Enzyme design. Structure first.
Site, mmCIF file in Angstrom:
data_model
loop_
_atom_site.group_PDB
_atom_site.id
_atom_site.type_symbol
_atom_site.label_atom_id
_atom_site.label_comp_id
_atom_site.label_asym_id
_atom_site.label_seq_id
_atom_site.Cartn_x
_atom_site.Cartn_y
_atom_site.Cartn_z
ATOM 1 C CD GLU A 230 0.587 -9.251 4.790
ATOM 2 O OE1 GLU A 230 0.767 -10.199 3.984
ATOM 3 O OE2 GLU A 230 1.539 -8.591 5.294
ATOM 4 N NE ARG B 195 1.631 -9.321 -0.001
ATOM 5 C CZ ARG B 195 2.055 -8.300 0.742
ATOM 6 N NH1 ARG B 195 1.951 -8.383 2.064
ATOM 7 N NH2 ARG B 195 2.571 -7.206 0.177
ATOM 8 C CB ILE C 203 -0.889 0.017 1.257
ATOM 9 C CG1 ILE C 203 -1.965 -1.080 1.144
ATOM 10 C CG2 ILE C 203 -1.534 1.394 1.447
ATOM 11 C CD1 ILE C 203 -2.887 -1.163 2.335
HETATM 12 O O1 LIG Z 1 1.999 -2.336 2.542
HETATM 13 C C1 LIG Z 1 2.227 -3.183 3.641
HETATM 14 C C2 LIG Z 1 3.578 -3.859 3.509
HETATM 15 O O2 LIG Z 1 4.539 -2.921 3.932
HETATM 16 C C3 LIG Z 1 5.899 -3.306 3.815
HETATM 17 O O3 LIG Z 1 6.420 -2.825 2.599
HETATM 18 C C4 LIG Z 1 6.924 -1.511 2.649
HETATM 19 C C5 LIG Z 1 8.455 -1.564 2.587
HETATM 20 O O4 LIG Z 1 8.942 -1.716 3.918
HETATM 21 C C6 LIG Z 1 9.105 -0.344 1.913
HETATM 22 O O5 LIG Z 1 10.424 -0.689 1.518
HETATM 23 C C7 LIG Z 1 8.324 0.123 0.686
HETATM 24 O O6 LIG Z 1 8.433 -0.813 -0.368
HETATM 25 O O7 LIG Z 1 6.969 0.376 1.038
HETATM 26 C C8 LIG Z 1 6.190 -0.673 1.598
HETATM 27 C C9 LIG Z 1 4.981 -0.052 2.292
HETATM 28 O O8 LIG Z 1 4.061 0.443 1.347
HETATM 29 C C10 LIG Z 1 6.128 -4.817 3.957
HETATM 30 O O9 LIG Z 1 6.245 -5.434 2.690
HETATM 31 C C11 LIG Z 1 5.034 -5.487 4.790
HETATM 32 O O10 LIG Z 1 5.232 -5.048 6.116
HETATM 33 C C12 LIG Z 1 3.609 -5.123 4.366
HETATM 34 O O11 LIG Z 1 2.990 -6.186 3.662
#
Ligand SMILES: OC[C@H]1O[C@H](O[C@H]2[C@H](O)[C@@H](O)[C@@H](O)O[C@@H]2CO)[C@H](O)[C@@H](O)[C@@H]1O
Ligand SMILES: *[C@@H]1O[C@H](CO)[C@@H](O[C@@H]2O[C@H](CO)[C@@H](O)[C@H](O)[C@H]2NC(C)=O)[C@H](O)[C@H]1NC(C)=O
EC number: 3.2.2.22
Length: 246
Positions: free
Chosen positions: A160, A163, A71
């Site tokens: 989630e 997934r 997101i």
């Molecule tokens: O959207 C929920 C998702 O968030 C996390 O991904 C982040 C990640 O930490 C950042 O590097 C970047 O890519 O933005 C994302 C948030 O939008 C994880 O993948 C997980 O906690 C969760 O599914």
């Protein structure tokens, strides 16, 4: 776009939503019969818009990166909101451009960062359809501390669940009563990237993981997943994070 309305929602309608969400994510290949998310998508096509409506019919639009189901941000009335991270700032170049103002949230989308902002871990935050209704309502008006919890609810009940079939079922069980996520649920969330990688590495390794994935099962027992014959692979996981993004 995909939509979900909390007014009149039941396990069936929620299931149709999660089905719509999965079906809106592009893929050109399946690996062990599981859709493989794309390495990348250029421009606005990278983002799926999810229209969510609370029980009162108020709505937010959530932008989701279709390559990883992350997101990025959301629009509430005339204000857009984005995580404080490069990928979200990039998304802000494509979605919700017509918002009268853009607020960057004071945290990234990371579970650890959100839990810090919320003041509590996921283990302690009830999820369910009622919790989702509350989350949508909370996001309608800016409050960064309240929003961190709302977003923990939102990410789990949308991304989630998309997934993992087990997570979808966990939410359906919580259609009319919230409950904190099972330890199995938390384990799966935490293992999605690991699982996605090992399932892809299994392709040239006769179905065997290069590295076992440790998971907590339904009975709360820790198990080792070593190959693609595991229930986690044959039934549960529904989307694979491309190894090019791992
Ligand atoms: O959207 C929920 C998702 O968030 C996390 O991904 C982040 C990640 O930490 C950042 O590097 C970047 O890519 O933005 C994302 C948030 O939008 C994880 O993948 C997980 O906690 C969760 O599914
Ligand atoms: C592939 O994974 C399955 C797990 O689903 C492994 O089978 C399990 O392993 C031992 C016996 O070998 C038992 O503890 C479990 O009851 C087994 N479950 C099932 C469904 O058979 C299997 O060993 C793995 N195979 C390889 C090549 O490592």
């Amino acid at each position: 776009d995909v939509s979900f309305r909390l007014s009149g929602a039941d396990p069936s309608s929620y299931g149709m939503f999660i089905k719509d969400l999965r079906n809106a994510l592009p893929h050109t290949e399946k690996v062990y019969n599981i859709p493989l998310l794309l390495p990348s998508v250029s421009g606005a096509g990278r983002y799926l818009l999810m229209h969510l409506f609370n029980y009162d019919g108020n709505t937010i639009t959530v932008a989701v990166d279709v390559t990883n189901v992350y997101i990025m941000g959301y629009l509430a009335l005339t204000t857009s909101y984005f995580f404080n991270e490069p990928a979200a700032d990039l998304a802000s170049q494509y979605v919700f451009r017509s918002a009268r103002r853009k607020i960057t949230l004071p945290y990234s989308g990371n579970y650890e960062r959100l839990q810090i902002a919320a003041g509590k871990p996921r283990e302690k935050i009830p999820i369910g359809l009622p919790a989702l209704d509350t989350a949508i309502s909370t996001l309608l008006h800016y409050d960064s501390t309240a929003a961190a919890g709302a977003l923990l609810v939102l990410i789990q009940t949308t991304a989630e669940a998309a997934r993992f079939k087990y997570i979808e079922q966990q939410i359906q069980e919580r259609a009319y009563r919230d409950e904190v996520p099972s330890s199995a649920t938390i384990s799966l969330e935490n293992s999605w990237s690991g699982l996605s990688k090992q399932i892809q590495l299994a392709q040239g390794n006769n179905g065997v993981f290069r590295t076992p994935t440790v998971l907590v099962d339904s009975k709360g027992n820790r198990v080792q997943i070593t190959n693609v014959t595991s229930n986690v692979v044959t039934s549960n996981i529904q989307l694979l994070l491309n190894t090019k993004n791992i």
